[PDB]
Design a binder for these strands. Sequence first.
RNA 1: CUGACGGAGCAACGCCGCGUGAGUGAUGAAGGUCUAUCGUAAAACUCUGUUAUUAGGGAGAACAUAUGUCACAUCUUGACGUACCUAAUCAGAAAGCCACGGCUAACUACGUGCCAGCAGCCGCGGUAAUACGUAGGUGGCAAGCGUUAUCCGGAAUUAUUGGGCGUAAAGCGCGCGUAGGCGGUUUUUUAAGUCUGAUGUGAAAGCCCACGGCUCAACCGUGGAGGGUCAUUGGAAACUGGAAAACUUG
RNA 2: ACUUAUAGAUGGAUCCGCGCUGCAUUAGCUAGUUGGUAAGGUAACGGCUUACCAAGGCAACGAUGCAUAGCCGACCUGAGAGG
Lengths: 198, 80, 83, 136, 156, 130
Amino acid sequence: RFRGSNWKKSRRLGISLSGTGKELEKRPYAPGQHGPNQRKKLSEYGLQLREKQKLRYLYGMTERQFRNTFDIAGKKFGVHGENFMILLASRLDAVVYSLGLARTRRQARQLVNHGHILVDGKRVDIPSYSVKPGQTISVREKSQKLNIIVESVEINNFVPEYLNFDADSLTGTFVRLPERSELPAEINEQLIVEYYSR
Amino acid sequence: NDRKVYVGKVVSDKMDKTITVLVETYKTHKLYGKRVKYSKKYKTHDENNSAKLGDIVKIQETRPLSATKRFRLVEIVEES
Amino acid sequence: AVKIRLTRLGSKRNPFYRIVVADARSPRDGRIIEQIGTYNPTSANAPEIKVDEALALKWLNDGAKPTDTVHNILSKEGIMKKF
Amino acid sequence: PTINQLVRKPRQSKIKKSDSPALNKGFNSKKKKFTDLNSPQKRGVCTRVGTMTPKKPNSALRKYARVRLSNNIEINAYIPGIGHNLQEHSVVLVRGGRVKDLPGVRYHIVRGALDTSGVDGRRQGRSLYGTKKPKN
Amino acid sequence: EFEERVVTINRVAKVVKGGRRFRFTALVVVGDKNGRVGFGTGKAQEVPEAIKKAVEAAKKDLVVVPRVEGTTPHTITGRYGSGSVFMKPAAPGTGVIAGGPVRAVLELAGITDILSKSLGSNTPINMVRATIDGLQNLKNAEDVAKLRGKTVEELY
Amino acid sequence: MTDPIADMLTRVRNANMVRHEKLELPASNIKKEIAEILKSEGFIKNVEYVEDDKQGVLRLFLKYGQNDERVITGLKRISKPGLRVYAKASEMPKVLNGLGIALVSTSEGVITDKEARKRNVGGEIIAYVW
RNA sequence: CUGACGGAGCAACGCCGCGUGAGUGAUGAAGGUCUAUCGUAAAACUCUGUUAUUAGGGAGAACAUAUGUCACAUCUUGACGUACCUAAUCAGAAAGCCACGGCUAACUACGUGCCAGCAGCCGCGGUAAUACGUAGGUGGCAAGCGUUAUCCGGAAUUAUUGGGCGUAAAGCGCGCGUAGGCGGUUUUUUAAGUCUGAUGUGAAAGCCCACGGCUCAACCGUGGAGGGUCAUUGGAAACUGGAAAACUUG
RNA sequence: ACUUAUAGAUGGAUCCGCGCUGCAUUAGCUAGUUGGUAAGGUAACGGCUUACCAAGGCAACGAUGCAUAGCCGACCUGAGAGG
């Protein structure tokens, strides 16, 4: 999840990119050790490492654990660049991450601590799953939902396609893996999964 | 599963049928690909007949019935 | 001398096995020429008993008999007692 | 670039020799002849301390180590860092190869490595010339 | 507009009867994202507007990629001295592979979809030439058959 | 003179370097095949056959097109006595993604690079003429 | 009888199953490189069982002359036989990260006046080490920090695909010149071979693929890809191939 | 529940083949080099010891010497040849 402290990360990443943020109670320009000075210029590797500044805080898309489905379906369909950005957010921790039941970024992964256990499957109090065609994070085994997860049944509506909250479970999992639109705005494709293969 | 018609030519011979026939084939190496032709020697035998000074023949792979020699066949082309 | 054998690559989570005709003086693992398939004696994985022992049941008059407590699998069948 | 004489007569590769030839080796006494090992880990037991003065490119002052490896031959080292281990006669973990700017020496010391710990004047390094239990 | 990315920024001086005079050697890439890029010999001692100094005189020498649909119809490993590049067709979403400022004459052409590598050289004074010749040996889908003398559909 | 066509092959491109044609060349029974099956595509001014015995004489007369530019931009043989490379008629390669042509002898008469792909016939497939 | 095969201190050796803080929070202080920075630092409130007080813990599975007459069987299978352990659940912290600028991805400086000294090819302190001694961390991270050295595509520094000739690091003392690599034109007698192929279609666990058992990962499986001229030698003479000559001016 | 005319079989294999690396600071070739000819015998032909005689058998092509001396489903791995 966090691994430190975050909210200075307005000028580190872009933002967590799927909320409102904790950006500007102050001067949010200077990223580090530049307060009386100019901006940060451009490169590709400065660009690339900016990309992954907005990958490893955006989600818990930790290195040496996430590129893997990119190379795994590098035998499956399409130049895997946008496949990746829809291969890092096509999980039940993402079909339920935009579902709006969290208030910490960790609470779409911790939607199931004692929240959504058995999505047609076995009780799994985890962040992630294997979100195949029609794969949810659905109702609890001996419970249904909690007062830290069901306290946000539709805390923000219009949550994306394949997150069509049929509530009191607080998740929606309409069809399949998700079309990567309804996710970070200023992100690219050949600067998500065409920076990694080298 | 039968026995081939191995063939060849002759080079020399010694007392009372120390006979032979030449062996060769078309093939190449696995590395630098040239059609260089190649050979190795054999061991057939007769009473004294299949021998030097022209014995273009056939040979066999059977029971030798022999010392370390191996062949019983002579199926010819011609003589000199 | 002939006995039953099995294959090994990577899984279980339910007592599994296989059908083959290996040597007598050897362990459970053995080499198989005419692969007939495998066997699932876990009473849960019914979709894994695709054994087509066509050369393993031909030892009836060649040299074979239920041994090593393996007659239970042959108990359901009855392609023996031809003599 | 003609292939007839290429199976008649072949070619070579490049010509290179690997790094630290008198290293990655453990000298026999029972059978008297060395082992070609490329071992990960090894020891160092000391014969002198050693120091030569004439340094142009740096043009400051710092010494090194003269530590002998097995059974009668010259083996030489250097201590790259700001830490002076005014010591000898140790039993260590070798570091293999040479650091920049010392010819002929290819043998070194890991931080800690069973003999001492290191130059304890370091606390920010947390990973250089002796640095254990350092608040991150 | 040309995405006016600095190519290369090089120093020479001329030794004189006094204190030698420096300069900064540069140009700019002039990229329509359609296949051509030219250059301006902005021979001067200024770094940032040598970019502009090439936007001035670039259009004297730009040559066409005879584009095929996001691709090139035939395969090339040419060079006009040393710097060479390999180019092929490819599926229109492929992943993009390139070297230097020929990320500005492969990523700025009517292809984008290649397996393109720079065979051998990959320098600020060879990538251009390498790709320049790669593109000078091309042809459209209806014109080989005429210097040939037929219609093109007479090859398959 | 052991290959009766050898240099003569690229003499197309090493004669039409600046689009030129003053080069008369000698014959074969495949110098009744080298220059006779690309006139199938309007490539030569005239080679109808060799009209002599002893593998004689022939005007090369290399047609040049409407863009003025090298009808034969470049050309190599990759099939010469001393370089015998024999492949099948299936993966006969892609001659510049099919931009070029081949004219060559086969194991069932005489074909082109328009036949190997749709007849499975051929032996020492030769060159890439463009 | 196992000492064949088994029952395991487990080495954080493999890497994973995931667990050690939460709803967090107005910018929030007594401020640690800088002199607003990581400070949405903090507190003190609450949330998950999953570590921990107990508990019953029986996951698999079918064994056997006389039982009556090689298909085969009962009055005959719990050391680890207690796992899935939801379980109320307090708050039972996830060591510490490197260089610390720019490339290998890094942030600034007092110490430092060349005294110690920085340094993966490039590369740094002599009075502002945007390197060092040390100090609050941004790029990667949380069972992980610097190092240990082996071939891989990368190394196109093998050249089977991907090798220079005057010149890097490279051409004949040449009259001479065995073996043979190569070795005129056209028809060629060949009917071997390539064209490629009827066939044999003889198995594979898995193959150019995918999938199903499994708390997903340790541990098993359908095999349509015929098992790679394997059990038959081929028809195309366009030819390296049992090889008859003719052409001549070379 | 004994011993035999007989069997399907077990490791193998009597053996055939391509499997079967390097050292040119090792070519005038081993006397058995060429192969026929033995009383013999191993479930097994036969210079395998012996049975009889002539070597140029070789021949500048690796005779021969000769240095690590397992192979083969495995693993990192190439685009592919496979290496």
